[PDB]
Design a protein around this ligand. Structure first.
Ligand SMILES: [Zn+2]
Ligand SMILES: [Zn+2]
Ligand SMILES: [Zn+2]
Length: 87
DNA sequence: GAGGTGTGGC
DNA sequence: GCCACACCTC
């Protein structure tokens, strides 16, 4: 039940929220509103969370620490898969 | 691990 | 719109 349809070149992809469609439309337009501000870096991204992932390459930030060993991860889904190895 | 992206509470 | 969740593919 998706009411927000993409009307670009007969794409037809449909989403549940308008903000989802607006983000998808960037695949057709090449718009990248989220700019890395790291010194000397000119990378830009269509989604804010893609920029977050990029910043963690600059900072080495790994917020998701495994509570059963010393390993840490930049993303929760990486940790979740690793945790299965403990059980 | 990384890239891409569909989803939904707020 | 922000943000992280969740899943697929490589
Ligand atoms: Zn489209
Ligand atoms: Zn950067
Ligand atoms: Zn572990």
């Amino acid at each position: 039940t998706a009411t927000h349809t993409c009307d670009y070149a007969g794409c037809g992809k449909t989403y549940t929220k308008s903000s989802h469609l607006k983000a998808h439309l960037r695949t057709h337009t090449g718009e990248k509103p989220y700019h890395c501000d790291w010194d000397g870096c000119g990378w830009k991204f269509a989604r804010s969370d893609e920029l977050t992932r990029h910043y963690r390459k600059h900072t080495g930030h790994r917020p998701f620490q495994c509570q059963k060993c010393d390993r840490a991860f930049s993303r929760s889904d990486h940790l979740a898969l690793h945790m299965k190895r403990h059980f």
